Amino acid sequence: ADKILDLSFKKIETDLSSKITYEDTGVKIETDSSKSDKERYLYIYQNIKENWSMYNNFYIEIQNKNKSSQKINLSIQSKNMFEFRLKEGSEVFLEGKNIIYSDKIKEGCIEVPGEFEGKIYVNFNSLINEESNVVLDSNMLSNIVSWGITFIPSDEEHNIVIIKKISLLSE
Amino acid sequence: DKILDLSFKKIETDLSSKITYEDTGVKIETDSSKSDKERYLYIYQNIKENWSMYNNFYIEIQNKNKSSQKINLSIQSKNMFEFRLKEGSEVFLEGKNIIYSDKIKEGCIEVPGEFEGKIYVNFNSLINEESNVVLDSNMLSNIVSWGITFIPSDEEHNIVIIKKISLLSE
Ligand SMILES: [Cl-]
Ligand SMILES: [Cl-]
Ligand SMILES: [Cl-]
Ligand SMILES: [Cl-]
Ligand SMILES: [Cl-]
Ligand SMILES: [Cl-]
Ligand SMILES: [Cl-]
Ligand SMILES: [Cl-]
Ligand SMILES: [Cl-]
């Protein structure tokens, strides 16, 4: 039950000029920039409201028409707050015309080699929320740093409570 | 099941206390004044663990007084989010003579007099007030935005073709 994501190019934050063309399938993205500009980028995003708990990864069918390697990265947002980016060092899988290999996320990016024409596998455990360190397929329980009990004694001058045991149950 | 280590640090507000660690649990003795309405004893332990595999908080406690006590929970995640009892949530207090489902009143749990049983609290009854995020809620549950950034090579004219972007179930 693969879920195909709608590719809309109405929302773009960039510092380049480009020509986007829809074809039978997918879309061609042409950019004109310079070697000097080391801040160059073309961020393309969408606004949604979907539940993705039944999926475990991104499958990006991309093709590079240049001999030089490209670079791409992902960013997901949950609860209009938590932003998830590629976890540095995490393994991603690139399947080309004849070879499939593992490459680690470097400087927050995925290297797309020259003439690459294939698909890219990025598991959701590869996207993380920096601040919380919570990976996209987990929850806040994944990184508990403190637990405590607040006690508000009765109007009696001296109160005593006995705590025999505290544990965490799981179905 | 994971038996939490009963080792604490404490904050005292308008009261003094003693924490003795006996073989039959930890005894908490407080000395305070009926007039000091800001009385409050916070006992906690800082750690670095993963409780994803768990779903509930088991607390067996005994109240030595005839007057009710009030307890609250505070679980913190590295991002400095503190989760507390959700207002209107349900908690189960199983005593010897009385057993029932209880409600969170003013963010606290009423511990009846001479109570001597167990209190069950599900992690979905813990929430961060400002974010309004439940402690066991998965991130994938509510996705509001997703994006892809393209960083071109040094070549002046770059062309990348994206035929398809999907989510695979596993
Ligand atoms: Cl979409
Ligand atoms: Cl949507
Ligand atoms: Cl290839
Ligand atoms: Cl290359
Ligand atoms: Cl002791
Ligand atoms: Cl501690
Ligand atoms: Cl009881
Ligand atoms: Cl509260
Ligand atoms: Cl809060």
Side-chain angles (χ1 to χ4, degrees), chain B residues 8-69:
Chain B
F8 296 108
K9 291 180 179 178
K10 59 183 298 183
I11 309 297
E12 298 174 356
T13 301
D14 291 357
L15 62 73
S16 64
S17 51
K18 300 183 302 178
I19 305 183
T20 308
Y21 298 65
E22 300 179 359
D23 59 359
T24 181
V26 176
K27 176 183 298 180
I28 304 177
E29 303 173 59
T30 62
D31 181 359
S32 59
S33 300
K34 176 177 59 180
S35 58
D36 296 358
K37 298 180 299 179
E38 294 294 357
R39 300 179 304 242
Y40 204 66
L41 175 72
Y42 172 55
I43 63 184
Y44 68 99
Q45 180 179 359
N46 294 350
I47 63 181
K48 299 187 302 179
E49 296 177 356
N50 179 352
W51 296 359
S52 300
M53 67 284 307
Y54 303 118
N55 300 64
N56 296 248
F57 194 67
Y58 175 118
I59 172 61
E60 182 179 359
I61 188 178
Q62 179 181 1
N63 181 7
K64 288 289 186 175
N65 306 64
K66 291 186 176 182
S67 302
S68 61
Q69 303 296 352

XYZ file of all heavy atoms in Angstrom, chain B residues 8-69:
528
model
N 15.982 9.539 45.069
C 15.521 10.860 44.683
C 16.337 12.037 45.204
O 17.167 11.915 46.100
C 14.131 11.049 45.304
C 13.043 10.118 44.826
C 12.560 9.106 45.645
C 12.533 10.218 43.541
C 11.564 8.248 45.202
C 11.520 9.375 43.108
C 11.042 8.387 43.935
N 16.073 13.171 44.544
C 16.529 14.501 44.901
C 15.223 15.193 45.271
O 14.172 14.765 44.789
C 17.294 15.223 43.788
C 18.670 14.664 43.438
C 19.341 15.439 42.328
C 20.720 14.920 41.986
N 21.312 15.675 40.862
N 15.261 16.249 46.084
C 13.989 16.825 46.491
C 13.987 18.349 46.544
O 15.010 18.995 46.794
C 13.661 16.299 47.891
C 14.712 16.637 48.938
C 14.492 16.083 50.323
C 13.228 16.577 50.986
N 13.109 16.064 52.371
N 12.789 18.891 46.323
C 12.506 20.309 46.424
C 11.390 20.399 47.462
O 10.421 19.643 47.385
C 12.081 20.950 45.086
C 13.040 20.654 43.929
C 11.873 22.450 45.268
C 14.431 21.194 44.112
N 11.548 21.301 48.435
C 10.594 21.480 49.518
C 9.992 22.878 49.454
O 10.724 23.855 49.390
C 11.316 21.372 50.862
C 11.968 20.032 51.132
C 12.797 20.025 52.408
O 12.923 21.093 53.031
O 13.272 18.947 52.803
N 8.659 22.982 49.491
C 8.065 24.308 49.457
C 7.105 24.472 50.626
O 6.024 23.877 50.638
C 7.398 24.601 48.113
O 8.414 24.489 47.118
C 6.760 25.972 48.061
N 7.507 25.330 51.572
C 6.723 25.614 52.762
C 6.483 24.334 53.560
O 5.369 24.099 54.033
C 5.443 26.394 52.420
C 5.692 27.822 51.949
O 6.867 28.243 51.940
O 4.705 28.511 51.593
N 7.552 23.534 53.738
C 7.482 22.306 54.519
C 8.866 21.671 54.630
O 9.739 21.917 53.798
C 6.505 21.302 53.889
C 6.830 20.807 52.479
C 7.999 19.826 52.480
C 5.609 20.140 51.856
N 9.044 20.848 55.673
C 10.277 20.102 55.872
C 9.924 18.625 55.736
O 8.772 18.237 55.964
C 10.936 20.399 57.186
O 10.118 19.996 58.266
N 10.913 17.807 55.373
C 10.656 16.395 55.170
C 11.893 15.531 55.388
O 13.019 16.023 55.407
C 10.118 16.182 53.781
O 10.951 16.814 52.822
N 11.620 14.232 55.541
C 12.609 13.186 55.712
C 12.247 12.049 54.759
O 11.078 11.656 54.669
C 12.628 12.612 57.132
C 12.935 13.588 58.261
C 13.010 12.905 59.623
C 11.732 12.175 59.989
N 11.826 11.480 61.295
N 13.259 11.533 54.056
C 13.061 10.438 53.125
C 13.909 9.262 53.599
O 15.122 9.255 53.409
C 13.398 10.863 51.680
C 12.610 12.108 51.255
C 13.180 9.706 50.717
C 12.853 12.537 49.830
N 13.258 8.286 54.246
C 13.948 7.102 54.731
C 13.707 5.980 53.728
O 12.589 5.820 53.240
C 13.468 6.704 56.133
O 13.558 7.840 56.992
C 14.252 5.549 56.720
N 14.769 5.235 53.396
C 14.667 4.130 52.459
C 14.679 2.818 53.240
O 15.733 2.329 53.629
C 15.778 4.187 51.403
C 15.755 5.417 50.531
C 15.978 6.682 51.055
C 15.422 5.328 49.189
C 15.943 7.814 50.255
C 15.364 6.451 48.382
C 15.629 7.699 48.913
O 15.569 8.796 48.088
N 13.482 2.269 53.466
C 13.321 1.028 54.205
C 13.276 -0.148 53.233
O 13.313 0.040 52.018
C 12.048 1.105 55.051
C 12.069 2.239 56.061
C 10.814 2.375 56.906
O 9.872 1.581 56.703
O 10.787 3.269 57.773
N 13.212 -1.362 53.793
C 13.151 -2.578 52.997
C 11.746 -2.736 52.421
O 11.558 -3.434 51.426
C 13.566 -3.804 53.819
C 12.724 -4.047 55.062
O 11.806 -3.242 55.320
O 12.993 -5.043 55.763
N 10.771 -2.066 53.053
C 9.380 -2.119 52.630
C 9.005 -0.827 51.900
O 7.908 -0.301 52.086
C 8.465 -2.419 53.827
O 7.118 -2.489 53.354
C 8.558 -1.393 54.936
N 9.924 -0.329 51.059
C 9.684 0.881 50.289
C 10.325 2.122 50.905
O 11.114 2.025 51.845
N 9.954 3.288 50.356
C 10.467 4.574 50.801
C 9.383 5.294 51.598
O 8.272 5.479 51.103
C 10.924 5.427 49.602
C 11.382 6.814 50.032
C 12.012 4.733 48.798
N 9.729 5.700 52.829
C 8.821 6.425 53.704
C 9.054 7.926 53.522
O 10.187 8.400 53.581
C 9.021 6.021 55.171
C 8.172 6.797 56.174
C 8.412 6.442 57.633
C 8.088 5.007 57.983
N 8.355 4.730 59.415
N 7.962 8.661 53.293
C 8.013 10.100 53.097
C 7.261 10.765 54.243
O 6.046 10.620 54.357
C 7.430 10.480 51.724
C 8.154 9.749 50.589
C 7.448 11.990 51.530
C 7.594 10.028 49.214
N 8.012 11.501 55.069
C 7.487 12.201 56.227
C 7.570 13.707 55.995
O 8.660 14.240 55.777
C 8.331 11.848 57.449
C 8.397 10.363 57.748
C 9.373 10.009 58.858
O 9.201 10.508 59.987
O 10.319 9.248 58.580
N 6.421 14.388 56.076
C 6.380 15.828 55.891
C 5.845 16.498 57.154
O 4.951 15.968 57.819
C 5.516 16.240 54.691
O 4.175 15.804 54.925
C 6.011 15.679 53.377
N 6.434 17.656 57.469
C 6.037 18.488 58.593
C 5.712 19.853 57.990
O 6.599 20.517 57.461
C 7.117 18.522 59.679
C 6.759 19.353 60.904
O 5.652 19.937 60.930
O 7.587 19.402 61.835
N 4.427 20.227 58.002
C 3.994 21.485 57.418
C 2.839 22.089 58.219
O 2.344 21.470 59.155
C 3.632 21.275 55.969
O 2.598 20.305 55.837
N 2.424 23.306 57.834
C 1.351 24.023 58.509
C 0.088 24.060 57.651
O 0.145 24.330 56.453
C 1.787 25.420 58.872
O 2.921 25.400 59.734
N -1.054 23.835 58.311
C -2.370 23.841 57.693
C -2.643 25.162 56.970
O -3.385 25.186 55.992
C -3.417 23.591 58.786
C -4.875 23.661 58.353
C -5.846 23.323 59.472
C -5.722 24.233 60.678
N -6.693 23.872 61.738
N -2.029 26.253 57.450
C -2.229 27.573 56.868
C -1.400 27.794 55.596
O -1.844 28.520 54.708
C -1.961 28.642 57.900
O -0.645 28.526 58.414
N -0.194 27.210 55.515
C 0.653 27.368 54.337
C 0.044 26.589 53.173
O 0.330 25.409 53.000
C 2.093 26.919 54.608
C 2.822 27.745 55.656
O 2.222 28.718 56.159
O 3.978 27.399 55.972
N -0.742 27.283 52.340
C -1.442 26.668 51.223
C -0.525 26.382 50.034
O -0.971 25.769 49.066
C -2.617 27.554 50.803
C -3.686 27.753 51.872
C -4.841 28.624 51.428
C -4.420 30.030 51.050
N -5.576 30.845 50.609
N 0.739 26.822 50.096
C 1.677 26.568 49.012
C 2.556 25.356 49.329
O 3.560 25.147 48.653
C 2.534 27.806 48.725
C 1.753 28.994 48.182
C 1.139 28.792 46.804
O 1.352 27.719 46.205
O 0.434 29.710 46.332
N 2.168 24.552 50.334
C 2.915 23.358 50.706
C 3.116 22.496 49.468
O 2.178 22.327 48.683
C 2.154 22.479 51.700
C 1.796 23.142 53.016
C 1.023 22.176 53.894
N -0.169 21.670 53.223
C -1.426 21.843 53.625
N -1.706 22.559 54.699
N -2.413 21.313 52.921
N 4.304 21.893 49.331
C 4.526 21.103 48.139
C 5.849 20.349 48.281
O 6.837 20.944 48.716
C 4.574 22.092 46.968
C 4.246 21.556 45.601
C 2.961 21.116 45.322
C 5.170 21.552 44.572
C 2.605 20.665 44.061
C 4.831 21.097 43.305
C 3.546 20.655 43.048
O 3.199 20.194 41.800
N 5.856 19.034 47.992
C 7.086 18.252 48.032
C 7.291 17.540 46.698
O 6.525 16.662 46.310
C 7.114 17.245 49.184
C 8.346 16.332 49.188
C 9.602 17.093 49.594
C 8.148 15.136 50.102
N 8.375 17.914 46.028
C 8.738 17.354 44.744
C 9.978 16.480 44.880
O 11.042 16.975 45.246
C 8.931 18.497 43.750
C 9.501 18.113 42.412
C 8.923 17.148 41.606
C 10.604 18.790 41.920
C 9.460 16.828 40.368
C 11.150 18.486 40.690
C 10.585 17.498 39.915
O 11.152 17.260 38.698
N 9.796 15.180 44.617
C 10.872 14.195 44.642
C 11.036 13.701 43.211
O 10.034 13.402 42.549
C 10.570 13.062 45.646
C 9.316 12.271 45.248
C 10.473 13.629 47.052
C 8.898 11.213 46.229
N 12.286 13.684 42.719
C 12.534 13.260 41.352
C 13.933 12.668 41.174
O 14.799 12.783 42.043
C 12.503 14.448 40.389
C 13.652 15.407 40.576
C 14.751 15.333 39.730
C 13.760 16.221 41.694
C 15.861 16.138 39.912
C 14.866 17.045 41.884
C 15.925 16.995 40.995
O 17.046 17.787 41.145
N 14.138 12.069 39.997
C 15.415 11.489 39.620
C 15.640 11.786 38.141
O 14.711 11.659 37.342
C 15.456 9.985 39.907
C 16.784 9.333 39.537
C 16.851 7.854 39.843
O 15.909 7.258 40.358
N 17.989 7.250 39.536
N 16.855 12.254 37.814
C 17.258 12.566 36.451
C 17.966 11.346 35.873
O 18.793 10.728 36.541
C 18.126 13.827 36.377
C 17.367 15.077 36.769
O 16.147 15.040 36.924
N 18.062 16.201 36.843
N 17.629 11.029 34.619
C 18.161 9.864 33.937
C 18.278 10.145 32.438
O 18.172 11.285 31.994
C 17.230 8.663 34.219
C 15.827 8.892 33.644
C 17.169 8.351 35.707
C 14.862 7.756 33.899
N 18.570 9.080 31.685
C 18.657 9.107 30.233
C 18.280 7.706 29.765
O 19.141 6.831 29.667
C 20.041 9.503 29.705
C 20.538 10.891 30.088
C 21.830 11.285 29.389
C 22.984 10.341 29.647
N 24.208 10.764 28.924
N 16.982 7.500 29.517
C 16.483 6.195 29.119
C 15.405 6.310 28.046
O 14.981 7.405 27.679
C 15.913 5.480 30.348
C 16.945 5.180 31.423
C 16.377 4.525 32.671
O 15.143 4.368 32.741
O 17.174 4.137 33.553
N 14.982 5.140 27.557
C 13.945 5.023 26.547
C 12.810 4.204 27.161
O 13.019 3.065 27.570
C 14.522 4.446 25.248
C 13.501 4.270 24.142
O 12.301 4.427 24.356
N 13.963 3.885 22.966
N 11.628 4.824 27.269
C 10.445 4.196 27.837
C 9.374 3.999 26.763
O 8.187 3.892 27.076
C 9.905 5.034 29.009
C 10.809 5.158 30.200
C 12.043 4.599 30.380
C 10.534 5.905 31.398
N 12.550 4.946 31.605
C 11.646 5.744 32.254
C 9.462 6.695 31.831
C 11.708 6.342 33.514
C 9.523 7.281 33.076
C 10.633 7.103 33.904
N 9.802 3.940 25.495
C 8.880 3.760 24.385
C 8.150 2.421 24.496
O 6.968 2.329 24.178
C 9.603 3.859 23.062
O 10.217 5.128 22.907
N 8.873 1.393 24.954
C 8.327 0.049 25.082
C 7.312 -0.067 26.222
O 6.696 -1.122 26.376
C 9.467 -0.954 25.297
C 10.208 -0.817 26.620
S 11.464 0.701 26.675
C 12.490 0.322 25.045
N 7.124 1.001 27.013
C 6.198 0.947 28.136
C 4.937 1.742 27.801
O 4.920 2.485 26.820
C 6.913 1.426 29.404
C 8.163 0.642 29.725
C 9.402 1.259 29.756
C 8.119 -0.725 29.958
C 10.562 0.550 30.029
C 9.271 -1.452 30.226
C 10.498 -0.813 30.262
O 11.660 -1.511 30.528
N 3.881 1.562 28.613
C 2.620 2.250 28.360
C 1.946 2.777 29.629
O 1.065 3.627 29.511
C 1.616 1.347 27.637
C 2.101 0.863 26.287
O 3.090 0.138 26.201
N 1.386 1.221 25.230
N 2.292 2.264 30.823
C 1.647 2.750 32.042
C 2.636 2.937 33.192
O 3.717 2.358 33.198
C 0.508 1.847 32.525
C -0.652 1.784 31.557
O -1.733 2.284 31.859
N -0.421 1.241 30.374
N 2.201 3.734 34.182
C 2.986 4.054 35.364
C 2.308 3.408 36.575
O 1.202 3.792 36.945
C 3.057 5.576 35.533
C 4.084 6.089 36.512
C 5.438 5.947 36.247
C 3.708 6.694 37.701
C 6.391 6.434 37.128
C 4.663 7.168 38.589
C 6.003 7.037 38.302
N 2.975 2.412 37.171
C 2.466 1.679 38.322
C 3.060 2.258 39.605
O 4.277 2.323 39.744
C 2.781 0.190 38.128
C 2.430 -0.744 39.262
C 1.501 -1.759 39.090
C 3.045 -0.639 40.501
C 1.185 -2.635 40.116
C 2.746 -1.511 41.535
C 1.812 -2.513 41.344
O 1.512 -3.375 42.370
N 2.182 2.648 40.541
C 2.582 3.230 41.815
C 1.746 2.640 42.953
O 0.553 2.913 43.074
C 2.509 4.776 41.764
C 2.728 5.431 43.134
C 1.182 5.241 41.194
C 4.066 5.168 43.775
N 2.400 1.806 43.769
C 1.785 1.203 44.939
C 2.158 2.104 46.116
O 3.339 2.262 46.428
C 2.257 -0.244 45.091
C 1.626 -0.978 46.259
C 2.052 -2.430 46.412
O 2.862 -2.907 45.582
O 1.570 -3.083 47.363
N 1.149 2.716 46.748
C 1.416 3.644 47.833
C 0.422 3.450 48.973
O -0.693 2.961 48.774
C 1.380 5.084 47.277
C 1.836 6.130 48.302
C 0.001 5.404 46.711
C 1.860 7.545 47.760
N 0.858 3.845 50.170
C 0.037 3.787 51.365
C 0.032 5.159 52.036
O 1.083 5.769 52.239
C 0.546 2.757 52.374
C -0.307 2.704 53.635
C 0.169 1.713 54.666
O 1.181 1.033 54.496
N -0.556 1.640 55.768
N -1.167 5.622 52.391
C -1.354 6.891 53.069
C -1.516 6.601 54.558
O -2.453 5.907 54.942
C -2.574 7.635 52.522
C -2.813 8.982 53.172
O -2.005 9.457 53.968
N -3.911 9.623 52.801
N -0.590 7.114 55.383
C -0.635 6.906 56.826
C -1.648 7.800 57.537
O -1.886 7.596 58.725
C 0.706 7.247 57.484
C 1.871 6.297 57.245
C 1.700 4.986 57.959
C 2.909 4.092 57.838
N 2.749 2.868 58.654
N -2.234 8.785 56.845
C -3.148 9.675 57.542
C -4.586 9.399 57.121
O -4.820 8.743 56.118
C -2.821 11.147 57.300
C -1.380 11.473 57.644
O -0.473 10.952 57.008
N -1.167 12.320 58.635
N -5.519 9.900 57.938
C -6.941 9.775 57.669
C -7.343 10.806 56.618
O -8.297 10.589 55.882
C -7.769 9.920 58.951
C -7.630 8.789 59.959
C -8.576 8.919 61.145
C -8.503 7.754 62.109
N -9.465 7.896 63.228
N -6.581 11.907 56.543
C -6.829 12.966 55.578
C -6.171 12.598 54.252
O -5.056 12.075 54.241
C -6.308 14.290 56.075
O -6.908 14.647 57.312
N -6.834 12.961 53.147
C -6.344 12.663 51.812
C -5.070 13.442 51.475
O -4.808 14.523 51.994
C -7.412 12.930 50.778
O -7.806 14.296 50.797
N -4.271 12.840 50.591
C -3.042 13.426 50.097
C -3.275 13.736 48.627
O -4.243 13.244 48.051
C -1.898 12.414 50.169
C -1.646 11.840 51.552
C -1.197 12.866 52.559
O -0.913 14.012 52.222
N -1.055 12.430 53.801
